[PDB]
Structures are given as C-alpha cells and as structure tokens.
Amino acid sequence: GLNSVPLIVIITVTAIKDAIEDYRRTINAPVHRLSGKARFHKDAWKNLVVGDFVRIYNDDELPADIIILATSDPDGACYVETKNLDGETNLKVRQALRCGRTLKHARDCERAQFVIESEPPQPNLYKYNGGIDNLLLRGCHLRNTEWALGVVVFTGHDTKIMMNAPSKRARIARELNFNVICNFGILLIMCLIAAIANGIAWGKTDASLAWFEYGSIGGTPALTGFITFWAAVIVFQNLVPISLYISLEIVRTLQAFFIYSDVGMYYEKIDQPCIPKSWNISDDVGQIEYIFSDKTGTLTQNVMEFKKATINGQPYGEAYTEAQAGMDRRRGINVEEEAKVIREEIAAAKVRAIRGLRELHDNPYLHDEDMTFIAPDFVEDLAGKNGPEQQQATEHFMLALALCHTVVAEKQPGDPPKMIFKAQSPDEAALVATARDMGFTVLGMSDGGINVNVMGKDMHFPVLSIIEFNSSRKRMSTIVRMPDGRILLFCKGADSVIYSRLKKGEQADMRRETAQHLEMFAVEGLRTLCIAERELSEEEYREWRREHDLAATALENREEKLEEVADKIERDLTLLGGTAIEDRLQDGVPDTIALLADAGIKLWVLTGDKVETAINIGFSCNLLNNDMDLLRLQVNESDASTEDDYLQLAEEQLKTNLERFNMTGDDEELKRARKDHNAPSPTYALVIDGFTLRWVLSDSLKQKFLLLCKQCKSVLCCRVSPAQKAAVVSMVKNGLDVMTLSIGDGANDVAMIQEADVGVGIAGEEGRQAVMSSDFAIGQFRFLQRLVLVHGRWSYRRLAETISNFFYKNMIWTWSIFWYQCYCNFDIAYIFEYTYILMFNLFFTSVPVILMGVLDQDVSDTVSLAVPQLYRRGIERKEWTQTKFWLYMIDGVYQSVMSFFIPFIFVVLTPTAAGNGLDVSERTRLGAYIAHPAVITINGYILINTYRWDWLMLLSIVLSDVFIFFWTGVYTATTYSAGFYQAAPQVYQELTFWMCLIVTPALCLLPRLVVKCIQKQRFPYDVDIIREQANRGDFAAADAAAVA
Amino acid sequence: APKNRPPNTAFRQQRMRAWQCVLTPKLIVTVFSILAAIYLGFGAWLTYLAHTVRDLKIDYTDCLTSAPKDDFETIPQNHITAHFSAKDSTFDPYKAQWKTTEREVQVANYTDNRQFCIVRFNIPEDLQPTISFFYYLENFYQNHRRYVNSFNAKQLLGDAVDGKTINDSTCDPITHDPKGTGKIVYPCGLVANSIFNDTFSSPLALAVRNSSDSSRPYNMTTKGIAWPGLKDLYGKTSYSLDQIVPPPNWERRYKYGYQENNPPPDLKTDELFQNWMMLAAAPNFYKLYQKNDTHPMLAGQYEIEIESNFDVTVYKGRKAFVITTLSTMGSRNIWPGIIFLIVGGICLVLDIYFILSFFIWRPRKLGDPSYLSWNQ
C-alpha cells in the first residue's frame, strides 16, 4: 500500500482539482438517452459515455460529437443552427444514416446493434468519416425534428467544439525536466551505493549477520546487492517528483483564480473580469520582454468621432487632436498657455455652435456634449448666412450623411430621445451619427427606405438599392430616390478609390482644394473619407440593374461578376466634399505605455494605419520621446520588379543603421545577443513601413534585421498586413530565445495572438474573435499595467520559490533516510514507521509550500506599480536559475546531516535517554525523534523564505506542525501499530525529545538565516530595498492615494 | 442586478492580514539575542544534568580467555569506564578483580553445565535510589529488512495460529522443528531466536570486615523494566504443548522440548523478552536488565556472577554491563549540553558581529536609493 495508496490519491486529487477549477471558472444540459435503460429517459451532461443511445427534441443543444441513425421525419433529416460555432448563418441539414431508418420506439432501440468504426480527432471543421452528413455539432441547435435517435460516437473533450481551443506551457514548466532528471540521477546514485555496499557487507560471513540471520533474501552477495538496489528505489520514493506536478498544478490554478477574481481589472461596461483562459501560463507573464500591440481597439477607443469636413472647398475644421498638440507644444511655440487656451477657444466654439443648432427647428435627438463635428461656421452657413447655394450645398451634404448608409436605428425613451445608429463598422457609423447631430434624424428602413426629418420636418427617401462596402471595395454606394421624385446615387469611400471614378476634368477648382484639405487632414492624425454623388436616370439605373442582377443570379464566380456589372454605373461620380474621422486615444494608455517601457520591456506597435499618423500618435501615447533619435527603414518604389534593387536597398539601409554602432549581421554578435536581456537603451527607435518589412524579412537579412530590432527601445510597423504581424512575432520569438506578449482585438490579430507565448485579447468593439483565441480576455489596454506588473512578477517569483522549496524538502527527507542506512549495513530498513513515509509528502509538508507559492507577495499591490523597475529581475530570468537549484539542494543535504545526526547523538549514545529508565531508541522511537524536528524545520524553513507572513500561512504552518503530534498520538494508541504502539506518551513525556525538538530546527536553519540576513544587509537586491522603503512609509503615500 | 463583478473581500483581492517580515538590524539582533539566550540557558542546564549522573561500565567480552580459572586479578583499564566524582577514594573504580569458572546449573531437572565469570568491582559513592543495570552489545545488528519483520505478533499475543499461516509468514527460515516431527515453533521468528541470554546476579556487597554484615545482596528486580504498555501486546500462550518446540538456538535451555515441567515462557510477565523484541536502532546498543527503586547503593566493592552464554567474540563483537543512575534527561550524555552550547555560542558570536557591524561599522542607511541597480 505504501506506493499504491499515494498513486491513487494522486489521480483522485487531480480529478478533484480539475473539478474545482471548472467550478470556479464556469460558475448539466438536458439530453434524452437510453444501452440498457429500456427508455429514452432524460440525463445530464455529466452522464456521458461513448456509443450510448440518445434522443434529441426540437431546438435542443447537443452534448458532444454525435452520430444519428434515424428520426421521425422522412429522409432522416435534421436542421442545425450554428451561429455560435460557425460564422455562416444557414440552417445546415444533416441526414440520419440510411440503414437503420426504422428504429422509432422507446425500447425498440436495443436489438439492432450496429458497429461504429469511427476515426480519431478530425479537427478539420469539414472532415469526418469512418464527410459531414453525419456530423452533429455540439453548440448547434437541432431543429425541425420531432426527435432524433441519437447514437453519437464521441464525448468529453474528443469533440472539436472544445478541441479547437493550442495548449501552451510556461517557460520553466519546460526547463523543469533538467531538475527532475537530476533528481532521478541523485536517487540512482544513492541506490547504487546501497547495492554495492550491501552486497559487500553481506559477504563478510563472520559478522553477526552470518550467525543470527539465516541467509539473505536471495542467496548471493551480488544478488543481495540487486534486491537492495530495487528496495532502495522503493524506499527513497519521496525523491519521486510525482507530487511536484500536482503541487504546481494547484499553485498555478489558484494564481489564475486570483487574477480572474481581481476587481481592479473589471471593466464595468462590457461586464467581464480578466478571465484567464490559459491558467498554466501565469508565470510566463512575469518574464515578458516584447509586447506586440495593435492600433485600434487596443491602443485607441475604436469609437470614432466625426472631426472635420470640407465641402465646396469651404472647410469646417474647428477642432484639435492630441497628435498636433504634442507636435506643436514640444517646442517653444504653443507650449503650455496656448495648449490650454486652444481648447478654451474650442469650448467657446462648442457653445456658439450649440446656440446655432438650437436656432433650428426642434430635433429632440440633438443632445449637448454628444456632438463632435463642432463648427459654428457649419451651422451659420446652413441657417442661411454667407451663402445662397453653399447653404444648399450644406443641406444636400447633411442629407447625404443621412442617406448614404445602411445603418439601423434604435431609440431610447424616457429622457429626451437620443437615437443610437448601429451598423457593421464604427467607421461609417460616425458619418450618420453626426448626421443626426445637427438635425436630419434618421429612423428605420421604413418599408420604402429610411425616414429623415430634414430640418426636423419629416420626409421619406425611397432607397432603391445598396452596394455594400467590402475590404476589397474601400467604398460603399447607396442608390436612393430623392424626395423631389428623381433618383440619386451616392458613393462614399477613400481617396485612391473614388478619385479614379470621377468625371475627368470637372470641378477641378473644388477638387484641387478638397484634395489638399485631405492632405492636411491625414497628416494631422485622422483617417478621412470622401463622398461622391451622381444624378441617375430611370432607364440608366435600369440598364445597370439588369446586368447587376443577371450576374448576381449567377451562382458560380459571383464574386468577380458583380465587380464587373456594378462597375458599369460607378465610372461617373462627382464630389460633394471631404470629411475627417478621429478615434480617441484610450483613457489610461499614455500612462500604461510609460509604465511598461519603464519596467524594461520593449513595445512594438504593429499598426495597420498610415505612417505619419502612426509616428505622431506614437509620440502622443508617450511611446516616443525627444531624445529617441528614431531611425527609419524605407525602401522606395520605381525599382521596377527586380529584387536586387529591393534587396540591395534594404541591405545598405540595414548596414548603415548597424554601422551607427558596432557591426552588422555577426553570428558571433548574434550568438552573444541570444543570451542577454539588459533593458534596452532608451535612446533609439525604429519606424518601418509595411513594404520594407516584406523585403527585410527575406531570409538573407532577417539575422541583420533581428540585431537592429534588439537594439532599439520601440518599433513602429506602419501599414502591416495580417501576415507580417505574425511573421515578425515568430521571427523575434524564434530568432532570439525571448518571451513574447501580443495584444489585440478582432479576427485581424488572431495570428498575432496565437504565434506568441502569451496572447491577450481586448474584448474590442470589433468582435469576439480575439477573445476566444486569447489567453486573458482583458477589458481594456490599461489593465496590462495591472496584470503584467502585479500578477506577472508575483506569479513568477512565487513559482520560483515554490519549486526551489519543493526540491529542498524532498532532499532533506530522503537524505535523512539515507544517512540512517549507513547504520543498518545499507540493508534498507525503515527508520520512520512507514505511515510517516506515506504521510510526509501529503499532510505534514505540502500545504505550507503550496501557500507560500500562492499567497506570498514581496512588495504590494500598489508599491509594485509605483516602482515598475522591479519587473526587470524577471526579464533577466533571475528568480529560477541553476545556481539557486544547487544551493537549495546543498541546503537540503546539510540540513539532512544535522537533522538526522542530532536526534541520534541524543538517544543512541546513552544507556536509557528516557529519564525514567525505560527504553527509547527503539528503531521507531528514534524515528519519531527525527521526524518531529524534521517536519518542524521544513516548514520553519519555508517561513524564512516567505516575505509576507499572513494569516493563512502561519495558520497552516501551525496546523501542519501540530498534525504530526496529533496523528502520532492517535495512531499509536491502537495495537494495529504494534511496534509503534505507545510512542506518543513514551516520547512526548521525555525531556530529550523536546530538547532535540528545539535544537534541531535552529541548527538546520542558522546557516540559511545568517546568509539571508547578511545578504539583505550587505548585498541587497532591489526588492529588499523597496521593502525597506515601504517600511519607513515612502510608498505609503502611494498606498494612500490608492485607498483614497 | 445581472452584475458580474468579483466579490470584494479580503481574500480574492489578496489583502489578508499580514506581517511584512522585513529584516532590519533591530530585528536581526533581537533574534540572535533571543536564540543565544535560550540556547546558552538550556545548554547550561543540560550539561549540569549530564555531569550529575555517575555510572560504571565494565567490558567482559574476553572473560572466557583472559581470566584465570583459579583466583582473581586485575581487569586492564581498557575495559573499565567510570564516571564518578569521589576523586580517589579507597575504592577507585578502575581496579576490578575478576575470575572465571565452569559450574553446573539446575535448569529444569536436567542440570546443564555453564561457564561463569565473577567480577569484583568498586563503587566509591552512594548511588541514589534509582539504579538501572544495562547490558551493552557492540557490532550486533538488530536492524535488517529481514530481521525486523520476522515475528508473528498475533502469536506472541497468545494464539494457536498453526502451520501454513505461520509457515509462509514473514518468519520464513525458523518456522518448524529442524527435525522430523512436524511441529510449530512457539516464540517463532528470527528475532525471538537470538535473544541475548547471559544471566547476571544481583550485586553482592563483599565483606571488608568493617561492616559486620558479610555479604548483603543488593536485590535488583527484573520486574518493571519494560514499558507497562507492552503487556498489551503479549500474553500467555494457547498451544497444547504437543505442537510447539523451542527455536533452534534455544535448545540448551529446553533440551527436551516444551514439557509440563519445562513449560513455555509466559511472555506477558517476561520483561527480559519484551526488552529484546523492541528492536534497537544501531549496532551498538544498550538494554535494561535489572532495576532498583527503593534503596541507595552504598559505597564498597561488589561482586557479580555473569554466566557467559552469548558468545560474542565469534563475530568480532563486544559485550559489557553498565550500572547507571538516572537524571531527568536520561543517563550520561555529555553531548546535548555541548551541542546546545555550541549553537548558543555561535548565535552569540553572530549577535556580536551583527550588533557591532550594523551599529558601529557602515550602518548602510536603510532603503537608500544607491543599491537599486537602476541608479547606477
């Protein structure tokens, strides 16, 4: 039982931990089933086996991957909704298998046995055999079916619906093999010493062994040795780390629960705390060096306001952004006083435009502090002033902003009714959101088209058709009947797309100024749009629509037929004006980035936007400075199609940037750079385009590139595609041996999330595609400073200390068994009353270690954010080293020497040692004598190491140290022990027992307490200095601000 | 309220009441000033105790060879060891006359002849009313994987467990009569087989002609030398005396088997067997033989008859007998005191070093921002 009972409680506690983790993560769906229940009784998901009968009613959720054989409706058909699983909406139809379409009853399911030779996990979403005619999904809903004779084929995790969700493992959970293998090495060295020494000491044939002990286990010296070897492998069992992995699993799942339940990372709007979908990676967060971010949904709010617009060459800008704020104020002009009076004048113009808007007819959907196209020039022109036809231009423009869309309307009663305008994109939604901001409020698609209350007085617009935007379009068009009876086409989009589809050579007086207005917009830090209109006729729109439909009715190659036949009306357009869209920088990013870059880690912004907006909004988000002499990598065009131009240009650029210091492409300066992590110099930065990236990521330059991208403090990647985003992560994570974090939202960045070590998904405005593929589903960007800088460095330091102590304690126990073996001729005899040997690694010494690993913290919640630089110690990977492992094992060996030879010198060197005459120093009384001080010194030594002695830890130390006394008092007093029968009263009453109990722990702890104190006084770390500072009360003002 | 926030408590947010254990050269010194105090104190107490008791151990492993058969002579002091403080009285517990002899013995109606050793030692101080008498066995391993599990405690308890259930028990070698007759062994095992069986007499105060009483025997009883909780494990047998036999090397005590007039031992009252059956932990060990509780051992020369049955010199071992008086710590162990004093002394040296340095040599201003590795 000595090994079988541990090896079953291990799987029991592993199952229980999985269960309680599922509990504290999800915080029993119904399926009708029967192979012997004689009835399709209802059962729950925890009753699932393989190949068991099932019944499934209308719209049921399905339990797992199922096969069916029949149902009520003919053809065996079944419908499924799959919007939760597959992005396509259609009700997908399966057929119940053909042979077996007659089973229809409550007990008639049993006799017709059918063999199911199915195939292993076929993750590929459209593959299964043993096609998809039998594949019933799990999250899908089974419909239009009276019942379903469910005979599935799989269950549990063997369904893709759970399988398609890349198990990663921490960096030290992969470098632990060296430590475990060295443990087995020392175990086999001890066992070989035992074998080769017992075989000798057994071949003496004169000593007291020959006369009184009748032979051996197997008569031979060199076979006695072999049996001793294997029995020693059994007896030094405690040096099997079987209990290391079930301890680390517990400490990791409990740290992950501690970050799931954090309220400082609860974003109140989306209503979602930081749900860690990868609990076994919580310490990886403490070693990050590179962060690969995004530039929409991640760094910015992704809620876009309509900032500027220019129509008929008249611009209504009257607004300011933070990019230009930094740009101008960072020099001597417009620095501070103008930095405030500019927004003062802006607010004055806001009030004046509020006045001008309220001079108009009643539009109740207009609310103060919800208008972002502030322009008293706009409203003064639309009211009637300063233009007869420019007023008409503004009216037509403002109506077009209320027609060109497909946005759907949602009204809020109660307070003055403000309408939200929802559509697929936060880009175009701002256009109609500002359309309703100056009147012209829009209602639903009113059965002929949308309803616009022009200057508050209502009117209808018959929308004929819509050609919707796609990433392959960059524009979207709406053909609508103008209220005066005529029809009118609108097409809104970017600059390079509309400008070709213009009537060549008209309104150049207006076009050559709206284009330069667009230049000023885009350089000012926005993403502008433009609108075109065209007067259509009925017959012209008809001769377009006929071909649009005849190519649309075509089922095959439809994607390239409508681009042809829809282009037959889009060649002719004329501009109505140009616009501008801003997206506010998120609230708390300019501090999170300064904090991260202060911790020492490097920040990469794989932005999909333009380059100059990227540089300016990288200055504005504290990512760049004035001392950061940014160096740029750019290969230009006109290089025909020949790579030698491109490759040579990129090469000379990289070579010059690498001659700006030591040398280029040196695989002796790479073989060296692959082994250092020293806090990048704060003076350099890179700005690389999305074109130069493609050529510098060529296989002959990557090395060179890598070296450059290790020297700089920041790297911008302007206008990258979904490909280079993950390609650069892979290049810098596999080129260097480095850790890596990737933040993002939207399906655009799934590859960035997945190809990195840690993948964090902002629950962004775009979608839940970067949440379901992430590790931590962060509310918004500024929670990174909490996660990475608090839970990251904690969870790393904690596991470092836990595994150090878990090796130390196994050593101190098994080596004190070994030391005894020297006195029993290495013939393996238990000194410890075997039940101690089976309870040690379970009760006496497990809980204190798990607790010092799960609830110990070096500085604080807030002193760790006030001083981020502490994180550097986890970047250099300096908490779990190889010197620490060997120092702790030498500590275990020394404490084993003392903790066996003191309670031996006490009792086995006197006649009686019991003070009332009778005999202790039986073989098991000495076992108790050396097992109580050992369980005291192990726990008292993992207090020396813990930093914050909190309530649970001291309580568990006391419980663990009194449990051995309790269970010896309770186990002895029963004849079932029979040699350890009354050792409780016979050992506790002694005086030598208590003298050894008080002098063994001290003699085994002093050589560590002295080192600890002298070091924390003469060779201090940074953590101990920050601790001695948070003891005065320095960062107590930080905690004070935090509690206030 | 369909909220989803995690409950703000003192546990989930990691705020539990704590004590930040930050070392300071006013927490270091007030620890190496408490440990040094407690350990020097306890060490002084324990060394005073260990210097209290007084005892004498005489080695006689070679009495059957180096002792003349006729009369007495001196034991070479490489055998005697003595810890008294009479400081050269007229007894000098290093002059122990000793002799050997061979004498017949009436064991049970068959009168086997044994070989005796007479020892005449001196005890110069009046030892105190609790005086134990241990025997000491060097180089005798009772701790072997096969030797410690080899008994049937369900039989020592007193049972008629017969034949196969004992044949295949952990007592594999010694479980039947090493002869024809199919017989159980009653104390069967390998540890009950090897029981040390020299017999000592009660010391006999020899006549110096000054005290009128020639030889008053100092009756030491072998009753109450085991724990009174061990008698909960043993008991009078239950075999019918026709299906048991003494173990192999018990025969010289029971040469005609277990008869009605040489019956098996009653293990419950046998307290020299319950001292053997609780195994030692080292090769060199002591076990209790005789105890005295109600009288002091007056000074003078005593004499002991030790029948030497356990031949120990055949495996290069040694054996001896020791007369100890007790303290509350145990018997004389000079080592607990010195260990406590060494730990206390090094705590005192480290306390001096810390108070001195961290107060007189470079206090290293607390929490100062010059060792922070980023201010350099």
Ligand SMILES: *[C@@H]1O[C@H](CO)[C@@H](O[C@@H]2O[C@H](CO)[C@@H](O[C@@H]3O[C@H](CO)[C@@H](O)[C@H](O)[C@@H]3O)[C@H](O)[C@H]2NC(C)=O)[C@H](O)[C@H]1NC(C)=O
């Ligand atoms: C510890 O040792 C002392 C040794 O003195 C034991 O006391 C001695 O015990 C005997 C028991 O027989 C005493 O009794 C004697 O009895 C005979 C007749 O039976 C009688 O003639 C004697 O005069 C005497 O009464 C003897 O008194 C006693 N010694 C003295 C001087 O009184 C003591 O018993 C030992 N401890 C234990 C547990 O026995």
Ligand SMILES: Nc1ncnc2c1ncn2[C@@H]1O[C@H](COP(=O)(O)OP(=O)(O)CP(=O)(O)O)[C@@H](O)[C@H]1O
């Ligand atoms: N309805 C619409 N009309 C006109 N143009 C549109 C449009 N919807 C999208 N676009 C344009 O198409 C592009 C779509 O790419 P998108 O802007 O989503 O990339 P992105 O900026 O989110 C990458 P990153 O996350 O790194 O910032 C936008 O730049 C936008 O200008």
Ligand SMILES: *[C@@H]1O[C@H](CO)[C@@H](O[C@@H]2O[C@H](CO)[C@@H](O)[C@H](O)[C@H]2NC(C)=O)[C@H](O)[C@H]1NC(C)=O
């Ligand atoms: C316990 O084992 C012994 C050893 O064989 C048993 O057998 C006796 O063996 C001797 C030879 O050494 C024979 O002469 C005896 O005749 C054997 N016993 C009998 C039945 O006569 C002994 O029998 C064993 N116990 C049992 C259950 O048989």
Ligand SMILES: *[C@@H]1O[C@H](CO)[C@@H](O)[C@H](O)[C@H]1NC(C)=O
């Ligand atoms: C006391 O000892 C003497 C010899 O030393 C012995 O004859 C006598 O029987 C002993 N008394 C008891 C009660 O055992």
Ligand SMILES: [Mg+2]
């Ligand atoms: Mg994005």
